[PDB]
Amino acid sequence: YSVLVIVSAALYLAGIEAYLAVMVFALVLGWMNALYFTRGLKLTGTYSIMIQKILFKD
Amino acid sequence: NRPILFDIVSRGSTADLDGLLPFLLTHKKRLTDEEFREPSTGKTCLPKALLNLSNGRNDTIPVLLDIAERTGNMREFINSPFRDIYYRGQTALHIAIERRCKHYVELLVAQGADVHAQARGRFFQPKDEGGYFYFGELPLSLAACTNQPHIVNYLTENPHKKADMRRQDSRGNTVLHALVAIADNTRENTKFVTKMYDLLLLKCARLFPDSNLEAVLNNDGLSPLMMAAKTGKIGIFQHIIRREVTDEDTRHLSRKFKDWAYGPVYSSLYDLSSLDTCGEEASVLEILVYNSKIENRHEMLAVEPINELLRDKWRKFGAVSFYINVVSYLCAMVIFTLTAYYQPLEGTPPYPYRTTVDYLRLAGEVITLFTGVLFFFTNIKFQLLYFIYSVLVIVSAALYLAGIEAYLAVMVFALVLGWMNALYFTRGLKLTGTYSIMIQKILFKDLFRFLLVYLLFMIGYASALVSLLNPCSCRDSETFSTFLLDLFKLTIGMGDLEMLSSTKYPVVFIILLVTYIILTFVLLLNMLIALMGETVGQVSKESKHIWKLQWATTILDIERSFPVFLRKAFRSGEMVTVGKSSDGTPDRRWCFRVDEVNWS
Amino acid sequence: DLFKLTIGMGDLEMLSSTKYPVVFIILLVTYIILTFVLLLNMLIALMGETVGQVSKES
Amino acid sequence: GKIGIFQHIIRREVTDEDTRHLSRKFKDWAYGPVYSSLYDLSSLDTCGEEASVLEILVYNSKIENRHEMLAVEPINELLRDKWRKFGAVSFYINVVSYLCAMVIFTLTAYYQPLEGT
Amino acid sequence: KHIWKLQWATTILDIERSFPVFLRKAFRSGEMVTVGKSSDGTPDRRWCFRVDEVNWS
Ligand SMILES: CCc1cccc([C@@H](O)CO)c1
């Protein structure tokens, strides 16, 4: 997430419009990452434990 | 001073104490004097002498006792209670019994120690009530709960002061109640608790035969058997249920009499006192099925007399009444549905009844009123759902009579609620043993948690995507709301993908859309495989357990619904002339026959 | 119309006729909940007695 | 993943006075059945000074016996005390901080004008 | 059925590792107690955690 946001900032400083897309992708990862906080809840625990990271890499 | 005396007592030196004795007698200062008592705890010299002992015996305590009897203040000196909140009411006798030393215990009892002293400090309160060791708040209870049979024998049988083993706590607990309270389910604890419970019950029978120590009930109204049932102590509950006394002098205490036993089969008369009470007394069945929330209940209902009693109740008045209930409620609901559908289309409330069909509809309406008033009176004298259904029916009838045309809304809502009450929200056994909705554990209130995570994830994804959509007016938050609606429509169904017209880069939009769809599918698969996993993984021993709990709940509800006379009419078991009682008359106690099989 | 809304091809022209929109909406949303529960339990039983057949079985 | 020796080391008691400083579970006070034992938190809670047995236990241990060792009374009660002292408060603070940061990021990207280059 | 304990332990250790070392020591668990004399004769000041238990045997 941080690499993506820094890449977007580097593109924005460069003057490349493409930043929005890269920056948008980072934001998406930020919402997915918030599930770590929801790991404890029983309903979405099984999804937050291993799906969101390992399943996202695969 | 305090420190020098305490140090001399701790080191066990007697010469210094004998040299301080003339000071004590000359200063007319008793050991109980405020200068010698510890300020924070109210502690006296004697409990300190009891606490720190070497090799089990030291002369410090006898020298203190001689000093106190010489100053003549022994009675106050012995019964000096600790005063701090941590240790309140503790007496030297409690510490003497505590340290497993019998000789100090008997010395203190002979000198005149109070035997019924109650220690109700925060340390001695039950573990749940901010405490540490709830030993029963009594020296005899302390001796019993610390596994000191000799101390119990001495306290209960001594010439100096006889301990009243029928004594009750400030909480009302007897020594048997204390033994139940300290009991756990481990092997050694259950072992010595059962052995000492038998010892104490037999002793109380021997001392004064008429009263049974189990008859004494806690301030909450719970007998030791009832207390074990409520708290969930499987070991002592099991032992009390099948207590058999081989001694013929006191056999009234025994509950599991043996009619005959050839080989593995044992035919036993289990006493049903306080189990099938029939409303005269609280029932161990009622407490076990309703109040006790411990998982041990699953095993607690597994004892032979309780299981066979529930099966007998089901055979006698369980199945027939359950079928009558379900059939009657289904017929009432069918009548309600027919009345609601066939309500007259044209007219104003109230509506006239002219033809025979109108009279049939009126009969259905009065049947509904009968059901509603029945439920109202049943709950008022409190099943919330039935109460809501009944009050909705009543207000619907009131609106119908008063002329309000809103009778159709409340009445149909009551229809749906009544149907769901029978089918969806089952209090006991399900209307059908094979039920399509039986497997699900989803609740209407729970559904909101299921939907909320979807809503939050979707709104977050949409908030991410509208920012990319903004280049395309679009900057207004109204466009954000429109894209929320459009994305919900797209994720629920095909939406032509018009938004890719707005985006500068459609490829990243495609990647985001496909990853969002697959993530949503995986999240759905997880939150639905949870139920499937519970269905294929948790029916191994739990399904039959929850079925047994439902069946017991239905049996007890039907049993309570009956009037007292009919309840006694359907009483299980038979009067048995089990044997000659102590007074010389035969003993007549309700018993249940159990043919238990044990393969050697 | 009710079947069409259950499938997804329904239209909310039903709500225009009714005198009391709020209770009608409440009843319909509850009905969707119960129909979804019925279909979910059907699929649960389907998958359960499908996986009842195992590798040794097949 | 060796549970037995791990329990023995975390609950070690030696009686010999010369070598009684090797104990880790010191009885403090007793009252019949109940008694209080002070377990030694050496390598169980180093506060980041060195490797801590708890951290190796949660992350590095890939054995199926991880839950048994986490159920050992010193470790379990230490985790419960950590949760009680600052676990819930700091967890909710982190949740609120992330949520607000993500909302801020969503707003700033949205309101961004992107007028030309 | 077993993951939840492990996941809560992960949550608490991450939160505790997020803190600076001085903040780590500020919220230490247990208290110093004079357990006894060491080999050299000096008392051993050890951070110890009090656990209350029962033994019926
Ligand atoms: C006889 C059927 C019946 C009607 C009303 C209440 C009950 C029980 O719920 C009593 O609590 C049963």
PDB file of C-alpha atoms in Angstrom, chain B residues 405-409 412-413 416 420 424 436-440 442 444 447 528-529 531-532 535, chain C residues 19-20 23 26-27 29-31 33-34 36-38 40-45 47-48 51-52:
ATOM      1  CA  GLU B 405     -59.551   1.281   8.183  1.00  0.00           C
ATOM      2  CA  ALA B 406     -55.994   0.461   9.325  1.00  0.00           C
ATOM      3  CA  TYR B 407     -57.202  -2.920  10.615  1.00  0.00           C
ATOM      4  CA  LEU B 408     -55.799  -4.678   7.527  1.00  0.00           C
ATOM      5  CA  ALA B 409     -52.185  -3.730   8.321  1.00  0.00           C
ATOM      6  CA  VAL B 412     -51.721  -9.087   8.402  1.00  0.00           C
ATOM      7  CA  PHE B 413     -48.639  -8.221  10.453  1.00  0.00           C
ATOM      8  CA  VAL B 416     -46.964 -13.074   9.582  1.00  0.00           C
ATOM      9  CA  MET B 420     -43.174 -17.172  12.078  1.00  0.00           C
ATOM     10  CA  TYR B 424     -39.313 -19.767  12.668  1.00  0.00           C
ATOM     11  CA  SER B 436     -36.111 -27.492   5.977  1.00  0.00           C
ATOM     12  CA  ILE B 437     -35.299 -24.400   8.144  1.00  0.00           C
ATOM     13  CA  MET B 438     -34.214 -26.528  11.172  1.00  0.00           C
ATOM     14  CA  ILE B 439     -30.485 -26.625  10.178  1.00  0.00           C
ATOM     15  CA  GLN B 440     -29.999 -22.807   9.843  1.00  0.00           C
ATOM     16  CA  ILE B 442     -29.294 -17.410  11.196  1.00  0.00           C
ATOM     17  CA  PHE B 444     -33.354 -11.785  11.831  1.00  0.00           C
ATOM     18  CA  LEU B 447     -28.772 -10.854   9.570  1.00  0.00           C
ATOM     19  CA  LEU B 528     -21.787 -19.119   3.923  1.00  0.00           C
ATOM     20  CA  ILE B 529     -19.329 -22.016   4.345  1.00  0.00           C
ATOM     21  CA  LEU B 531     -22.880 -22.388   8.371  1.00  0.00           C
ATOM     22  CA  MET B 532     -22.136 -25.379   6.064  1.00  0.00           C
ATOM     23  CA  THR B 535     -23.696 -28.255   9.720  1.00  0.00           C
TER      24      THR B 535
ATOM     25  CA  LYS C  19     -52.615   1.774   0.963  1.00  0.00           C
ATOM     26  CA  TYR C  20     -49.914   1.282   3.617  1.00  0.00           C
ATOM     27  CA  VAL C  23     -45.939  -2.437   6.408  1.00  0.00           C
ATOM     28  CA  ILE C  26     -41.499  -4.597   5.909  1.00  0.00           C
ATOM     29  CA  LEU C  27     -43.372  -7.746   4.899  1.00  0.00           C
ATOM     30  CA  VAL C  29     -38.139  -7.526   2.999  1.00  0.00           C
ATOM     31  CA  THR C  30     -38.894 -10.230   5.576  1.00  0.00           C
ATOM     32  CA  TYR C  31     -40.192 -12.444   2.767  1.00  0.00           C
ATOM     33  CA  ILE C  33     -35.052 -12.936   4.018  1.00  0.00           C
ATOM     34  CA  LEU C  34     -37.065 -16.130   4.513  1.00  0.00           C
ATOM     35  CA  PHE C  36     -33.146 -16.622   0.862  1.00  0.00           C
ATOM     36  CA  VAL C  37     -32.960 -18.740   4.022  1.00  0.00           C
ATOM     37  CA  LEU C  38     -35.007 -21.506   2.377  1.00  0.00           C
ATOM     38  CA  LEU C  40     -29.641 -21.375   1.390  1.00  0.00           C
ATOM     39  CA  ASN C  41     -30.779 -24.376   3.500  1.00  0.00           C
ATOM     40  CA  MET C  42     -31.674 -26.220   0.286  1.00  0.00           C
ATOM     41  CA  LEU C  43     -28.186 -25.586  -1.108  1.00  0.00           C
ATOM     42  CA  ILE C  44     -26.620 -26.512   2.243  1.00  0.00           C
ATOM     43  CA  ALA C  45     -28.394 -29.877   2.221  1.00  0.00           C
ATOM     44  CA  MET C  47     -23.771 -29.771  -0.825  1.00  0.00           C
ATOM     45  CA  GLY C  48     -23.825 -31.822   2.378  1.00  0.00           C
ATOM     46  CA  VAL C  51     -19.977 -34.392  -0.274  1.00  0.00           C
ATOM     47  CA  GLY C  52     -21.494 -37.358   1.537  1.00  0.00           C
TER      48      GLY C  52
END
